[PDB]
Design an enzyme around this catalytic site. Structure first.
Site, PDB file in Angstrom:
ATOM      1  N   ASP A  24       0.785  -1.230   0.000  1.00 38.80           N
ATOM      2  CA  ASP A  24       0.000   0.000   0.000  1.00 38.80           C
ATOM      3  C   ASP A  24       0.826   1.293   0.000  1.00 38.80           C
ATOM      4  OD1 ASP A  24      -2.008   2.003   0.664  1.00 38.80           O
ATOM      5  OD2 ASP A  24      -3.286   0.335   1.273  1.00 38.80           O
ATOM      6  N   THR A  25       0.923   1.942  -1.157  1.00 43.02           N
ATOM      7  CA  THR A  25       1.679   3.184  -1.280  1.00 43.02           C
ATOM      8  C   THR A  25       1.005   4.350  -0.556  1.00 43.02           C
ATOM      9  OG1 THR A  25       0.585   3.685  -3.386  1.00 43.02           O
ATOM     10  CG2 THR A  25       2.681   2.507  -3.479  1.00 43.02           C
ATOM     11  N   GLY A  26      -0.264   4.178  -0.212  1.00 45.30           N
ATOM     12  CA  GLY A  26      -0.975   5.237   0.480  1.00 45.30           C
ATOM     13  C   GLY A  26      -0.838   5.140   1.986  1.00 45.30           C
TER      14      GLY A  26
HETATM   15  C1  LIG Z   1     -11.640  -2.401   0.766  1.00 43.90           C
HETATM   16  N1  LIG Z   1     -11.180  -1.068   1.168  1.00 43.90           N
HETATM   17  C2  LIG Z   1     -10.274  -0.289   0.508  1.00 43.90           C
HETATM   18  O1  LIG Z   1      -9.706  -0.606  -0.539  1.00 43.90           O
HETATM   19  C3  LIG Z   1     -10.101   0.995   1.292  1.00 43.90           C
HETATM   20  N2  LIG Z   1      -8.582   1.081   1.596  1.00 43.90           N
HETATM   21  C4  LIG Z   1      -7.932   1.604   2.658  1.00 43.90           C
HETATM   22  O2  LIG Z   1      -8.508   2.133   3.611  1.00 43.90           O
HETATM   23  C5  LIG Z   1      -6.378   1.443   2.601  1.00 43.90           C
HETATM   24  O3  LIG Z   1      -5.935   1.189   1.266  1.00 43.90           O
HETATM   25  C6  LIG Z   1      -5.491   2.647   3.020  1.00 43.90           C
HETATM   26  C7  LIG Z   1      -5.864   4.021   2.398  1.00 43.90           C
HETATM   27  C8  LIG Z   1      -4.767   5.062   2.548  1.00 43.90           C
HETATM   28  N3  LIG Z   1      -4.922   5.775   3.775  1.00 43.90           N
HETATM   29  C9  LIG Z   1      -4.811   7.206   3.535  1.00 43.90           C
HETATM   30  C10 LIG Z   1      -5.008   8.115   4.748  1.00 43.90           C
HETATM   31  C11 LIG Z   1      -4.042   9.157   5.051  1.00 43.90           C
HETATM   32  C12 LIG Z   1      -4.253  10.014   6.217  1.00 43.90           C
HETATM   33  C13 LIG Z   1      -5.432   9.804   7.058  1.00 43.90           C
HETATM   34  C14 LIG Z   1      -5.718  10.639   8.245  1.00 43.90           C
HETATM   35  C15 LIG Z   1      -5.071  11.898   8.549  1.00 43.90           C
HETATM   36  C16 LIG Z   1      -5.556  12.473   9.750  1.00 43.90           C
HETATM   37  S1  LIG Z   1      -6.821  11.502  10.551  1.00 43.90           S
HETATM   38  C17 LIG Z   1      -6.694  10.302   9.250  1.00 43.90           C
HETATM   39  C18 LIG Z   1      -6.385   8.747   6.735  1.00 43.90           C
HETATM   40  C19 LIG Z   1      -6.175   7.911   5.589  1.00 43.90           C
HETATM   41  N4  LIG Z   1      -3.923   5.415   4.607  1.00 43.90           N
HETATM   42  C20 LIG Z   1      -4.125   4.757   5.767  1.00 43.90           C
HETATM   43  O4  LIG Z   1      -5.260   4.423   6.167  1.00 43.90           O
HETATM   44  C21 LIG Z   1      -2.877   4.437   6.593  1.00 43.90           C
HETATM   45  N5  LIG Z   1      -2.753   5.771   7.231  1.00 43.90           N
HETATM   46  C22 LIG Z   1      -1.770   6.638   6.993  1.00 43.90           C
HETATM   47  O5  LIG Z   1      -0.821   6.496   6.227  1.00 43.90           O
HETATM   48  O6  LIG Z   1      -1.986   7.795   7.779  1.00 43.90           O
HETATM   49  C23 LIG Z   1      -0.929   8.755   7.918  1.00 43.90           C
HETATM   50  C24 LIG Z   1      -2.782   3.249   7.624  1.00 43.90           C
HETATM   51  C25 LIG Z   1      -3.760   3.410   8.783  1.00 43.90           C
HETATM   52  C26 LIG Z   1      -2.930   1.891   6.970  1.00 43.90           C
HETATM   53  C27 LIG Z   1      -1.379   3.246   8.243  1.00 43.90           C
HETATM   54  C28 LIG Z   1      -6.013   0.161   3.472  1.00 43.90           C
HETATM   55  C29 LIG Z   1      -6.863  -1.119   3.160  1.00 43.90           C
HETATM   56  C30 LIG Z   1      -6.701  -1.888   1.934  1.00 43.90           C
HETATM   57  C31 LIG Z   1      -7.521  -3.060   1.681  1.00 43.90           C
HETATM   58  C32 LIG Z   1      -8.512  -3.473   2.658  1.00 43.90           C
HETATM   59  C33 LIG Z   1      -8.685  -2.715   3.889  1.00 43.90           C
HETATM   60  C34 LIG Z   1      -7.868  -1.545   4.143  1.00 43.90           C
HETATM   61  C35 LIG Z   1     -10.836   2.273   0.541  1.00 43.90           C
HETATM   62  C36 LIG Z   1     -10.246   2.558  -0.847  1.00 43.90           C
HETATM   63  C37 LIG Z   1     -12.370   2.029   0.313  1.00 43.90           C
HETATM   64  C38 LIG Z   1     -10.675   3.571   1.342  1.00 43.90           C
END
Ligand SMILES: CNC(=O)[C@@H](NC(=O)[C@@](O)(CCCN(Cc1ccc(-c2ccsc2)cc1)NC(=O)[C@@H](NC(=O)OC)C(C)(C)C)Cc1ccccc1)C(C)(C)C
EC number: 3.4.23.16
Lengths: 99, 99
Positions: free
Chosen positions: A25-27
């Protein structure tokens, strides 16, 4: 290798001698794995995702192999919907995005 | 181009006549953006990530441009903490993970 994204980029990782499936996950800033046992002491960390925040256990300098590539870094353990490999480890294995 | 992962892979996207900054996320099934107006019909959807689920509006066949590359696909709009460009669009611009 070159991984396309038509399907989830799930790969096999090895940690604590056990094989598991994880998502590249690059995000993700960090790497978070589902509940498991790891050695040493851990520190607390609050991480934020799309659905909100969760509490995780932070373990540092943990050896972990990703698709055969060796890495040693911080691994977070907590109630995550799926094992995710973040940039902290993707950088260690020389991963980049290309298009 | 080749995007390193030392820092968050942020890019500029053009959508609905607006310019927004979004995160290229290989681990995201869908593309989800913060509240904005989009033309056409939509349907409610619940998406899950770290922390739980959030309710969003699903708009299909939405034109979008990322780093100069044009594409079209489903865009989810809702209370996401950050704009994410998921695999459904990353594939269209020929984005791949390499290491
Ligand atoms: C089936 N679900 C998805 O594909 C989802 N995917 C995800 O949530 C992730 O792909 C991650 C999305 C990227 N987010 C971005 C982000 C950035 C800042 C905040 C943010 C900033 C202030 S309050 C919240 C909130 C979200 N990244 C993350 O969720 C990651 N967080 C991070 O890097 O934070 C600094 C971590 C928790 C996995 C470390 C992880 C994942 C993959 C597959 C299954 C379940 C979960 C969807 C596209 C619907 C949102």
């Amino acid at each position: 290798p070159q991984i396309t994204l038509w399907q989830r980029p799930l790969v096999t990782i090895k940690i604590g001698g056990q094989l598991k499936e994880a998502l590249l996950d690059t995000g993700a800033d960090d790497t978070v794995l589902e509940e498991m046992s790891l050695p040493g002491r851990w520190k607390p960390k609050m991480i934020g995702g799309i659905g909100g925040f969760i509490k995780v256990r932070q373990y540092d300098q943990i050896p972990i192999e990703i698709c055969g590539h060796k890495a040693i870094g911080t691994v977070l353990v907590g109630p995550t919907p799926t094992n995710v490999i973040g940039r902290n480890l993707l950088t260690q294995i020389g991963c980049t995005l290309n298009f």
